[PDB]
Amino acid sequence: MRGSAHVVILGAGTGGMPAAYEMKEALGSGHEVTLISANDYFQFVPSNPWVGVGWKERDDIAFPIRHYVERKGIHFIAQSAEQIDAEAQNITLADGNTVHYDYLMIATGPKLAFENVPGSDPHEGPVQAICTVDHAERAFAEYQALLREPGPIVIGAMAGASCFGPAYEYAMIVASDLKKRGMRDKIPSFTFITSEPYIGHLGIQGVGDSKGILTKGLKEEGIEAYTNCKVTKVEDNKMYVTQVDEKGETIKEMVLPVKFGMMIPAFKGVPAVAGVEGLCNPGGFVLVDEHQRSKKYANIFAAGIAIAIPPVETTPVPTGAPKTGYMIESMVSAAVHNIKADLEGRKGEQTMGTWNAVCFADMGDRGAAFIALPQLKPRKVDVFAYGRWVHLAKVAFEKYFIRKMKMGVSEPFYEKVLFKM
Amino acid sequence: MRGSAHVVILGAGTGGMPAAYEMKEALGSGHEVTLISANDYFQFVPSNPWVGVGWKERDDIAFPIRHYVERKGIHFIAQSAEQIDAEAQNITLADGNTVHYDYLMIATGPKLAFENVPGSDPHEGPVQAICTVDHAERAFAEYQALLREPGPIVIGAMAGASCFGPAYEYAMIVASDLKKRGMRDKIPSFTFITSEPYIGHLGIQGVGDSKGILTKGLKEEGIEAYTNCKVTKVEDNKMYVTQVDEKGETIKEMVLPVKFGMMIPAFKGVPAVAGVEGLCNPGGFVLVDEHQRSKKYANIFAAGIAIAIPPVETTPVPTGAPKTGYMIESMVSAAVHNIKADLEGRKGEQTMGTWNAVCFADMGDRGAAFIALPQLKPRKVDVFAYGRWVHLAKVAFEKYFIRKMKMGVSEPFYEKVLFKM
Ligand SMILES: Cc1cc2nc3c(=O)[nH]c(=O)nc-3n(C[C@H](O)[C@H](O)[C@H](O)COP(=O)(O)OP(=O)(O)OC[C@H]3O[C@@H](n4cnc5c(N)ncnc54)[C@H](O)[C@@H]3O)c2cc1C
Ligand SMILES: Cc1cc2nc3c(=O)[nH]c(=O)nc-3n(C[C@H](O)[C@H](O)[C@H](O)COP(=O)(O)OP(=O)(O)OC[C@H]3O[C@@H](n4cnc5c(N)ncnc54)[C@H](O)[C@@H]3O)c2cc1C
Ligand SMILES: CCCCCCCCCCCCO[C@@H]1O[C@H](CO)[C@@H](O[C@H]2O[C@H](CO)[C@@H](O)[C@H](O)[C@H]2O)[C@H](O)[C@H]1O
Ligand SMILES: CCCCCCCCCCCCO[C@@H]1O[C@H](CO)[C@@H](O[C@H]2O[C@H](CO)[C@@H](O)[C@H](O)[C@H]2O)[C@H](O)[C@H]1O
Ligand SMILES: [S]
Ligand SMILES: [S]
Ligand SMILES: [S]
Ligand SMILES: [S]
Ligand SMILES: [S]
Ligand SMILES: [S]
Ligand SMILES: [S]
Ligand SMILES: [S]
Ligand SMILES: [S]
Ligand SMILES: [S]
């Protein structure tokens, strides 16, 4: 309302949950902050691959949101938004209620576009997914069904995927778990299928020696690997795969039987967001300026996977670049600062800063991690690392992030760089 | 929500508007206060009779609510509540949206029960009303239509009415206005019909010499007056009146032609409130204890005309006792204090205090006013007064109340008793 602007944060995930806390901290008691989300619980997404193989439980990685944000003065609505009217500034919720806003921060993350590949939906066939804890629990269930009745495995990433690390991670920990169960010798074939132009491209044109290390890792585990692949359909428990060359010409088609499968899908914008006329690119991603402000609506900001980031290369099979945690938090921090500035006269000048990708994957006793910045080579930092200490760091950061999500955040975030001082 | 209770005030009138301000003042920034009302504007009800004869305009007595309450941190919803679910603690609004509450203060005032008398609705016949500015504007319109085409006048109060002062006031100022227009001699008959057992009973068994003074005033103006009357129907521009004796036996029936009429209707509780199972008496009035708390729902409080107050006498024709401004404000003050106490552990002990009725009527250059307390005789104060100074006081208080409704209130209210100190 006038003088007491109402700020709504849409989506309670990696970006939106911190956004809610930071917004409330920044605005104070004279402004209403409402967090709206489809689920009533927060989940730590990077832990999902482990849920998918049974090394972790939902209880370990998820928790109910209400109490933690309410004790901070944040209103929580656990309903999905179905429609956004950007002119009227109303959000229509699944239950039919409407919520008005003065400022809206979109942090709705990705729509998992299973529909790109007929039959690929986890509920339609044997190809599962581990992007959400719901799906990872289901993937694990189906993994247990593979144990009771061994058959071919196919793991990888679909055309248009932007999140490749987890596919390699999941394949490695499955291979590992199979060994630790003396079941590995029971698998007739274990195949890795990716839309990447080469192993370890990772949607970022490789990082450090990702190519060599991931290639060797796959071979070490007896996983046969194909690149430049798209899946045209999943049907009758078979994946129909087309493999192309540098020019997009088919060089083979394959029909792969699948008893147990997991393919990272392409991401699009969620329907409620993509449905806002003029707000998004054709993929459903919100077009924002460097200050995280919508180019169309001055009172709509966005952060996280939900925003559009222009490609910098074109691969034989369409692929995207990942949007990862540190950059997401910088987007969030910039949006909150620039909204506050709008509320107080100024134009906020804060940006998300330099593009970067940072990923940590835990294999059990040790992990792999990379840091890449900026997006195009030659880079200022281009490191891939493997060690027991990556594992320790992943474990540490998970514990930390979950704690902060319960206790609240403010100021910036991360800056766990107190391990220097 | 937990730790930050949400308080909703239903109705933005004489009680509810101050309730919103006082609630927000009392609770502070850590609690949401939402004011919900059917109209987007406040109106000063006691001024309506003057609107009804054209001595005042809507612009003089009403103003839009939003800006004034919002600048105080109060959320304003200009929608009628249609349904209240006291179990779920949800209010369904006219537009279909729902509002949840932790505490609800009902200040919905009266439903004007025109349906008690078939044909009496201001839109169904010549019998108008002046309880709301919408209706008083309409009454005035019809008054102008009487000027252009003189015919019999009938003014008064229906069976079950509880608000008699305004009927006498309106009759006097009409008689007066007719004179000031040289139109008085054009009226074939001017009749006063009341459910009171005698002139000046006023629903409170008389006050001071109200009987004598009002009787004389009516005769002075050539107004013929009947008591112990109920109107059974209005039809074909005639009022069908039945007059009874002390025992309820008919002593005559009358059929009165009406060119211009105004009868104060009986009040009931509004449907959304009356519709709450177990909340109200059969009249639709909220049953509350001395702390203004609902006897059924510990988190519902009520103030103003909306609450039930037991009768203390029974008249040949049903009548009720008025609920007037000073007592309403005491109810409001008690409810706010006791809600705050609930929020902070204690049980609030504040009550509305002694029953009283206080009314001021302006006739033009001078006014009449009464004060009566407590409800049953013999009283501690039982005064009726007439003078130029009542007029000056009415004018002063109207200006004051409207100003306070724009600038906000807190602490108690009234206590304009600084004219002593
Ligand atoms: C398997 C996997 C592993 C990953 N590992 C890493 C990693 O190790 N390091 C790293 O930096 N990044 C990693 N990421 C990427 C990124 O950090 C996560 O995807 C992160 O969760 C993205 O944050 P987000 O806020 O944009 O979206 P999300 O965390 O997905 O949150 C979006 C929220 O919006 C809600 N929502 C969606 N639609 C609606 C709607 N219509 N109405 C209301 N709410 C809605 C969703 O329920 C969700 O709560 C990983 C991603 C995946 C999929
Ligand atoms: C003609 C007249 C003259 C009077 N003169 C005096 C006087 O001189 N002195 C005195 O002390 N008292 C006087 N009174 C009596 C009393 O003070 C007023 O009636 C006063 O307005 C009552 O206050 P209230 O808050 O209970 O109800 P109201 O002032 O009627 O307010 C009720 C509010 O609730 C709203 N509402 C109703 N239903 C809903 C719904 N379902 N959802 C949302 N909102 C709803 C209404 O729009 C209204 O805004 C007079 C009354 C009348 C009718
Ligand atoms: C985080 C994003 C990346 C994607 C997800 C994860 C992919 C899975 C990782 C596969 C790597 C496994 O293969 C592993 O690689 C490194 C080589 O560099 C080897 O390790 C070698 O370098 C490390 C240090 O980095 C030394 O400590 C070690 O003594 C040496 O042998 C391991 O002997 C080999 O087993
Ligand atoms: C407020 C609630 C009451 C209901 C609404 C109003 C009803 C209308 C009022 C009718 C009274 C008119 O009648 C009027 O009464 C008083 C008598 O007491 C007279 O006034 C008499 O007493 C007053 C003081 O009170 C003296 O100042 C005056 O000199 C004296 O004549 C007026 O000469 C007479 O004209
Ligand atoms: S998923
Ligand atoms: S990712
Ligand atoms: S990734
Ligand atoms: S990642
Ligand atoms: S590079
Ligand atoms: S009315
Ligand atoms: S009244
Ligand atoms: S009255
Ligand atoms: S009154
Ligand atoms: S009395």
JSON list of N, CA and C in Angstrom, two decimals, chain A residues 202-246:
[
{"chain": "A", "resi": 202, "resn": "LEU", "atom": "N", "xyz": [29.83, -29.69, -19.81]},
{"chain": "A", "resi": 202, "resn": "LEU", "atom": "CA", "xyz": [29.10, -29.22, -18.63]},
{"chain": "A", "resi": 202, "resn": "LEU", "atom": "C", "xyz": [28.30, -27.96, -18.90]},
{"chain": "A", "resi": 203, "resn": "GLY", "atom": "N", "xyz": [28.00, -27.70, -20.16]},
{"chain": "A", "resi": 203, "resn": "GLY", "atom": "CA", "xyz": [27.25, -26.50, -20.52]},
{"chain": "A", "resi": 203, "resn": "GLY", "atom": "C", "xyz": [28.09, -25.24, -20.41]},
{"chain": "A", "resi": 204, "resn": "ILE", "atom": "N", "xyz": [29.39, -25.38, -20.15]},
{"chain": "A", "resi": 204, "resn": "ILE", "atom": "CA", "xyz": [30.26, -24.21, -19.99]},
{"chain": "A", "resi": 204, "resn": "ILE", "atom": "C", "xyz": [31.58, -24.34, -20.76]},
{"chain": "A", "resi": 205, "resn": "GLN", "atom": "N", "xyz": [31.57, -25.20, -21.77]},
{"chain": "A", "resi": 205, "resn": "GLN", "atom": "CA", "xyz": [32.73, -25.40, -22.64]},
{"chain": "A", "resi": 205, "resn": "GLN", "atom": "C", "xyz": [33.92, -25.96, -21.87]},
{"chain": "A", "resi": 206, "resn": "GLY", "atom": "N", "xyz": [33.62, -26.80, -20.89]},
{"chain": "A", "resi": 206, "resn": "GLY", "atom": "CA", "xyz": [34.65, -27.48, -20.12]},
{"chain": "A", "resi": 206, "resn": "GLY", "atom": "C", "xyz": [35.25, -26.57, -19.07]},
{"chain": "A", "resi": 207, "resn": "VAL", "atom": "N", "xyz": [35.82, -27.18, -18.03]},
{"chain": "A", "resi": 207, "resn": "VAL", "atom": "CA", "xyz": [36.45, -26.42, -16.97]},
{"chain": "A", "resi": 207, "resn": "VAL", "atom": "C", "xyz": [37.61, -27.24, -16.40]},
{"chain": "A", "resi": 208, "resn": "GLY", "atom": "N", "xyz": [38.78, -26.62, -16.33]},
{"chain": "A", "resi": 208, "resn": "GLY", "atom": "CA", "xyz": [39.97, -27.37, -15.95]},
{"chain": "A", "resi": 208, "resn": "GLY", "atom": "C", "xyz": [40.07, -28.58, -16.85]},
{"chain": "A", "resi": 209, "resn": "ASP", "atom": "N", "xyz": [40.38, -29.74, -16.29]},
{"chain": "A", "resi": 209, "resn": "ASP", "atom": "CA", "xyz": [40.43, -30.96, -17.08]},
{"chain": "A", "resi": 209, "resn": "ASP", "atom": "C", "xyz": [39.18, -31.79, -16.84]},
{"chain": "A", "resi": 210, "resn": "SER", "atom": "N", "xyz": [38.02, -31.14, -16.85]},
{"chain": "A", "resi": 210, "resn": "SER", "atom": "CA", "xyz": [36.75, -31.86, -16.70]},
{"chain": "A", "resi": 210, "resn": "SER", "atom": "C", "xyz": [36.60, -32.94, -17.79]},
{"chain": "A", "resi": 211, "resn": "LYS", "atom": "N", "xyz": [36.99, -32.64, -19.02]},
{"chain": "A", "resi": 211, "resn": "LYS", "atom": "CA", "xyz": [36.87, -33.63, -20.09]},
{"chain": "A", "resi": 211, "resn": "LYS", "atom": "C", "xyz": [37.61, -34.92, -19.73]},
{"chain": "A", "resi": 212, "resn": "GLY", "atom": "N", "xyz": [38.91, -34.79, -19.48]},
{"chain": "A", "resi": 212, "resn": "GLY", "atom": "CA", "xyz": [39.75, -35.94, -19.19]},
{"chain": "A", "resi": 212, "resn": "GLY", "atom": "C", "xyz": [39.33, -36.71, -17.95]},
{"chain": "A", "resi": 213, "resn": "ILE", "atom": "N", "xyz": [39.04, -35.98, -16.88]},
{"chain": "A", "resi": 213, "resn": "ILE", "atom": "CA", "xyz": [38.73, -36.63, -15.62]},
{"chain": "A", "resi": 213, "resn": "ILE", "atom": "C", "xyz": [37.36, -37.33, -15.65]},
{"chain": "A", "resi": 214, "resn": "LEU", "atom": "N", "xyz": [36.36, -36.67, -16.24]},
{"chain": "A", "resi": 214, "resn": "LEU", "atom": "CA", "xyz": [35.05, -37.30, -16.32]},
{"chain": "A", "resi": 214, "resn": "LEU", "atom": "C", "xyz": [35.07, -38.48, -17.30]},
{"chain": "A", "resi": 215, "resn": "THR", "atom": "N", "xyz": [35.78, -38.33, -18.41]},
{"chain": "A", "resi": 215, "resn": "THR", "atom": "CA", "xyz": [35.91, -39.41, -19.40]},
{"chain": "A", "resi": 215, "resn": "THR", "atom": "C", "xyz": [36.51, -40.64, -18.74]},
{"chain": "A", "resi": 216, "resn": "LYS", "atom": "N", "xyz": [37.63, -40.44, -18.05]},
{"chain": "A", "resi": 216, "resn": "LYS", "atom": "CA", "xyz": [38.31, -41.51, -17.35]},
{"chain": "A", "resi": 216, "resn": "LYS", "atom": "C", "xyz": [37.45, -42.13, -16.25]},
{"chain": "A", "resi": 217, "resn": "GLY", "atom": "N", "xyz": [36.72, -41.28, -15.54]},
{"chain": "A", "resi": 217, "resn": "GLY", "atom": "CA", "xyz": [35.85, -41.75, -14.47]},
{"chain": "A", "resi": 217, "resn": "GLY", "atom": "C", "xyz": [34.76, -42.66, -15.00]},
{"chain": "A", "resi": 218, "resn": "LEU", "atom": "N", "xyz": [34.12, -42.25, -16.09]},
{"chain": "A", "resi": 218, "resn": "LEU", "atom": "CA", "xyz": [33.10, -43.11, -16.72]},
{"chain": "A", "resi": 218, "resn": "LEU", "atom": "C", "xyz": [33.68, -44.46, -17.19]},
{"chain": "A", "resi": 219, "resn": "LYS", "atom": "N", "xyz": [34.81, -44.43, -17.89]},
{"chain": "A", "resi": 219, "resn": "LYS", "atom": "CA", "xyz": [35.45, -45.68, -18.34]},
{"chain": "A", "resi": 219, "resn": "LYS", "atom": "C", "xyz": [35.82, -46.59, -17.17]},
{"chain": "A", "resi": 220, "resn": "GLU", "atom": "N", "xyz": [36.37, -45.99, -16.12]},
{"chain": "A", "resi": 220, "resn": "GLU", "atom": "CA", "xyz": [36.74, -46.69, -14.89]},
{"chain": "A", "resi": 220, "resn": "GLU", "atom": "C", "xyz": [35.57, -47.50, -14.33]},
{"chain": "A", "resi": 221, "resn": "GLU", "atom": "N", "xyz": [34.36, -47.00, -14.52]},
{"chain": "A", "resi": 221, "resn": "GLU", "atom": "CA", "xyz": [33.18, -47.64, -13.95]},
{"chain": "A", "resi": 221, "resn": "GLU", "atom": "C", "xyz": [32.47, -48.53, -14.96]},
{"chain": "A", "resi": 222, "resn": "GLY", "atom": "N", "xyz": [33.08, -48.70, -16.13]},
{"chain": "A", "resi": 222, "resn": "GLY", "atom": "CA", "xyz": [32.50, -49.50, -17.19]},
{"chain": "A", "resi": 222, "resn": "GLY", "atom": "C", "xyz": [31.21, -48.91, -17.74]},
{"chain": "A", "resi": 223, "resn": "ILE", "atom": "N", "xyz": [31.12, -47.58, -17.72]},
{"chain": "A", "resi": 223, "resn": "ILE", "atom": "CA", "xyz": [29.97, -46.88, -18.27]},
{"chain": "A", "resi": 223, "resn": "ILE", "atom": "C", "xyz": [30.27, -46.44, -19.70]},
{"chain": "A", "resi": 224, "resn": "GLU", "atom": "N", "xyz": [29.46, -46.89, -20.65]},
{"chain": "A", "resi": 224, "resn": "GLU", "atom": "CA", "xyz": [29.68, -46.53, -22.05]},
{"chain": "A", "resi": 224, "resn": "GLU", "atom": "C", "xyz": [29.01, -45.20, -22.33]},
{"chain": "A", "resi": 225, "resn": "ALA", "atom": "N", "xyz": [29.70, -44.29, -23.00]},
{"chain": "A", "resi": 225, "resn": "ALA", "atom": "CA", "xyz": [29.25, -42.90, -23.05]},
{"chain": "A", "resi": 225, "resn": "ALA", "atom": "C", "xyz": [29.09, -42.34, -24.46]},
{"chain": "A", "resi": 226, "resn": "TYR", "atom": "N", "xyz": [27.98, -41.66, -24.70]},
{"chain": "A", "resi": 226, "resn": "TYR", "atom": "CA", "xyz": [27.69, -41.06, -25.99]},
{"chain": "A", "resi": 226, "resn": "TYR", "atom": "C", "xyz": [27.38, -39.59, -25.84]},
{"chain": "A", "resi": 227, "resn": "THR", "atom": "N", "xyz": [27.92, -38.78, -26.74]},
{"chain": "A", "resi": 227, "resn": "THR", "atom": "CA", "xyz": [27.70, -37.34, -26.69]},
{"chain": "A", "resi": 227, "resn": "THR", "atom": "C", "xyz": [27.01, -36.88, -27.96]},
{"chain": "A", "resi": 228, "resn": "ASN", "atom": "N", "xyz": [26.62, -35.61, -27.99]},
{"chain": "A", "resi": 228, "resn": "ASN", "atom": "CA", "xyz": [25.86, -35.06, -29.10]},
{"chain": "A", "resi": 228, "resn": "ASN", "atom": "C", "xyz": [24.57, -35.84, -29.34]},
{"chain": "A", "resi": 229, "resn": "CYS", "atom": "N", "xyz": [23.93, -36.27, -28.25]},
{"chain": "A", "resi": 229, "resn": "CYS", "atom": "CA", "xyz": [22.70, -37.05, -28.34]},
{"chain": "A", "resi": 229, "resn": "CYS", "atom": "C", "xyz": [21.48, -36.25, -27.91]},
{"chain": "A", "resi": 230, "resn": "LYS", "atom": "N", "xyz": [20.36, -36.50, -28.59]},
{"chain": "A", "resi": 230, "resn": "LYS", "atom": "CA", "xyz": [19.04, -36.10, -28.11]},
{"chain": "A", "resi": 230, "resn": "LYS", "atom": "C", "xyz": [18.14, -37.34, -28.06]},
{"chain": "A", "resi": 231, "resn": "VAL", "atom": "N", "xyz": [17.25, -37.38, -27.07]},
{"chain": "A", "resi": 231, "resn": "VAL", "atom": "CA", "xyz": [16.24, -38.42, -26.98]},
{"chain": "A", "resi": 231, "resn": "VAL", "atom": "C", "xyz": [14.96, -37.92, -27.63]},
{"chain": "A", "resi": 232, "resn": "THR", "atom": "N", "xyz": [14.49, -38.63, -28.65]},
{"chain": "A", "resi": 232, "resn": "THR", "atom": "CA", "xyz": [13.28, -38.22, -29.37]},
{"chain": "A", "resi": 232, "resn": "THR", "atom": "C", "xyz": [12.02, -38.73, -28.68]},
{"chain": "A", "resi": 233, "resn": "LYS", "atom": "N", "xyz": [12.11, -39.87, -28.00]},
{"chain": "A", "resi": 233, "resn": "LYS", "atom": "CA", "xyz": [10.97, -40.38, -27.26]},
{"chain": "A", "resi": 233, "resn": "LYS", "atom": "C", "xyz": [11.39, -41.53, -26.37]},
{"chain": "A", "resi": 234, "resn": "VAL", "atom": "N", "xyz": [10.61, -41.74, -25.31]},
{"chain": "A", "resi": 234, "resn": "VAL", "atom": "CA", "xyz": [10.74, -42.93, -24.49]},
{"chain": "A", "resi": 234, "resn": "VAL", "atom": "C", "xyz": [9.43, -43.68, -24.65]},
{"chain": "A", "resi": 235, "resn": "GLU", "atom": "N", "xyz": [9.51, -44.97, -24.95]},
{"chain": "A", "resi": 235, "resn": "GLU", "atom": "CA", "xyz": [8.32, -45.71, -25.33]},
{"chain": "A", "resi": 235, "resn": "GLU", "atom": "C", "xyz": [8.57, -47.21, -25.28]},
{"chain": "A", "resi": 236, "resn": "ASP", "atom": "N", "xyz": [7.63, -47.93, -24.69]},
{"chain": "A", "resi": 236, "resn": "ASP", "atom": "CA", "xyz": [7.76, -49.38, -24.52]},
{"chain": "A", "resi": 236, "resn": "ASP", "atom": "C", "xyz": [9.06, -49.70, -23.79]},
{"chain": "A", "resi": 237, "resn": "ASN", "atom": "N", "xyz": [9.42, -48.85, -22.83]},
{"chain": "A", "resi": 237, "resn": "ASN", "atom": "CA", "xyz": [10.64, -49.04, -22.06]},
{"chain": "A", "resi": 237, "resn": "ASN", "atom": "C", "xyz": [11.89, -49.04, -22.94]},
{"chain": "A", "resi": 238, "resn": "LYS", "atom": "N", "xyz": [11.88, -48.21, -23.97]},
{"chain": "A", "resi": 238, "resn": "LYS", "atom": "CA", "xyz": [13.07, -48.01, -24.78]},
{"chain": "A", "resi": 238, "resn": "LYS", "atom": "C", "xyz": [13.30, -46.53, -25.02]},
{"chain": "A", "resi": 239, "resn": "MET", "atom": "N", "xyz": [14.55, -46.10, -25.00]},
{"chain": "A", "resi": 239, "resn": "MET", "atom": "CA", "xyz": [14.87, -44.72, -25.32]},
{"chain": "A", "resi": 239, "resn": "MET", "atom": "C", "xyz": [15.27, -44.66, -26.76]},
{"chain": "A", "resi": 240, "resn": "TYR", "atom": "N", "xyz": [14.63, -43.78, -27.51]},
{"chain": "A", "resi": 240, "resn": "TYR", "atom": "CA", "xyz": [15.03, -43.59, -28.89]},
{"chain": "A", "resi": 240, "resn": "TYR", "atom": "C", "xyz": [15.97, -42.41, -28.92]},
{"chain": "A", "resi": 241, "resn": "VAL", "atom": "N", "xyz": [17.21, -42.69, -29.28]},
{"chain": "A", "resi": 241, "resn": "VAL", "atom": "CA", "xyz": [18.27, -41.71, -29.25]},
{"chain": "A", "resi": 241, "resn": "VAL", "atom": "C", "xyz": [18.75, -41.40, -30.66]},
{"chain": "A", "resi": 242, "resn": "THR", "atom": "N", "xyz": [18.93, -40.12, -30.95]},
{"chain": "A", "resi": 242, "resn": "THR", "atom": "CA", "xyz": [19.56, -39.69, -32.19]},
{"chain": "A", "resi": 242, "resn": "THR", "atom": "C", "xyz": [20.87, -38.97, -31.87]},
{"chain": "A", "resi": 243, "resn": "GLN", "atom": "N", "xyz": [21.95, -39.38, -32.53]},
{"chain": "A", "resi": 243, "resn": "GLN", "atom": "CA", "xyz": [23.25, -38.77, -32.31]},
{"chain": "A", "resi": 243, "resn": "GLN", "atom": "C", "xyz": [23.65, -38.02, -33.55]},
{"chain": "A", "resi": 244, "resn": "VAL", "atom": "N", "xyz": [24.09, -36.79, -33.39]},
{"chain": "A", "resi": 244, "resn": "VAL", "atom": "CA", "xyz": [24.45, -35.97, -34.54]},
{"chain": "A", "resi": 244, "resn": "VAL", "atom": "C", "xyz": [25.94, -35.66, -34.59]},
{"chain": "A", "resi": 245, "resn": "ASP", "atom": "N", "xyz": [26.37, -35.03, -35.68]},
{"chain": "A", "resi": 245, "resn": "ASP", "atom": "CA", "xyz": [27.75, -34.56, -35.81]},
{"chain": "A", "resi": 245, "resn": "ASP", "atom": "C", "xyz": [27.79, -33.05, -35.63]},
{"chain": "A", "resi": 246, "resn": "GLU", "atom": "N", "xyz": [28.98, -32.46, -35.80]},
{"chain": "A", "resi": 246, "resn": "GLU", "atom": "CA", "xyz": [29.17, -31.03, -35.60]},
{"chain": "A", "resi": 246, "resn": "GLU", "atom": "C", "xyz": [28.18, -30.15, -36.36]}
]
